[PDB]
C-alpha cells in the first residue's frame, strides 16, 4: 500500500524515485514520563488528516527509568502506534530510543526480530536501532553493534529501511561516511539537529557525508536548543529545511508532546484524542506544522 523505501548511493528512494517525507516523533514512551498518553490511534489519525504528516516515530525508551528494560508495556505502546500508522497509510519508525544500545544487544536483537517478524511485510515500517550514541567510537562501538542487529533483521525482512545512529548525539555522519556499513540493502544513517544549538558547521558535516555516498535520515530534529529547552530559532530552522529539501532528507520533529519545555509541539493539556486548534500549538508546534503541511 505505501511505496517501498530503498537506498541507492546517497539517496533514500520511495517506489524507486527521489523524494522525502516529513512527520513527527512522539516523546519517550517511558511509563511516568508523560508522552505515553499520545501513543494512540486518534493522535496518529489527526497528524495525518490535519498536519498532512507522512510519518510518526515511536521513541521506545530502553534503559532509562520506566523504559522497556524494566517495563514490558513500552512494547505495547509501540505496536499501538505501528498498527495505527499502517491503518492510516503513514510510514512509522520503530526507534530503540537509547544512548547505550550496544550494552543491550541481545534485547535489541530479540525486539527487532519480533518486529521484523510481525511487520516486515508492510512497506510502512522503518527500523531505527540506536537513537543517539554519545561521544563513542563509530568503528569500535556503534558499527559492530549496528552490524550485528542488521544481520538479524535482514534474515527476516530483506528490504525495509534500517537507520543507524552516529556518534555525538547522531551528529557525526561524516565519520560514518569514512567507514560505511557495506553489503546490506537499504541502510541509512541518522542525523539529529536542534536549530537553537546547531547550524552551518553541522550542515557542512552532513554535506561531506552525502558527498562520500551515504544516505541520511533526520529521525529527530527540533527548532529549539539541544536539551529540548529554549526559544524557537525560526531562521536557523528555515536554513535546515532548505538543506533537507535540497538533499531529499526525510525528517521527524521532536516532540509531539505537551510537557512545559520549548521542544513540545503542544500546550500542556492538549487532548490525547487530537483535534487541536491553533492555540493548542506552541511556537515550536506551529512552526513544525507549517513545515510538515508544506512538504513536497
Author numbering: 1 to 296
What does the paper say about this structure?
Here, we report a novel cellulase belonging to GH5 family, named as CelE1, retrieved from a sugarcane soil metagenomic library, which is a promising biocatalyst in biofuels production. CelE1 is 1284 bp long and encodes a polypeptide of 428 amino acid residues containing a putative N-terminal signal peptide followed by a glycoside hydrolase domain belonging to family 5 (GH5). Cellulases or endoglucanases (EC 3.2.1.4) catalyze the cleavage of random internal β-1,4-glycosidic bonds in cellulosic chains and can be found coupled to the cellulosome or generally secreted as independent enzymes. A new plant cell wall-degrading enzyme with ability to breakdown complex cellulose-based substrates was isolated and characterized from sugarcane soil metagenome. This enzyme was shown to be an endo-acting glucanase with high catalytic activity at a broad temperature range and under alkaline conditions that usually cause enzyme inactivation of classical acidic cellulases.
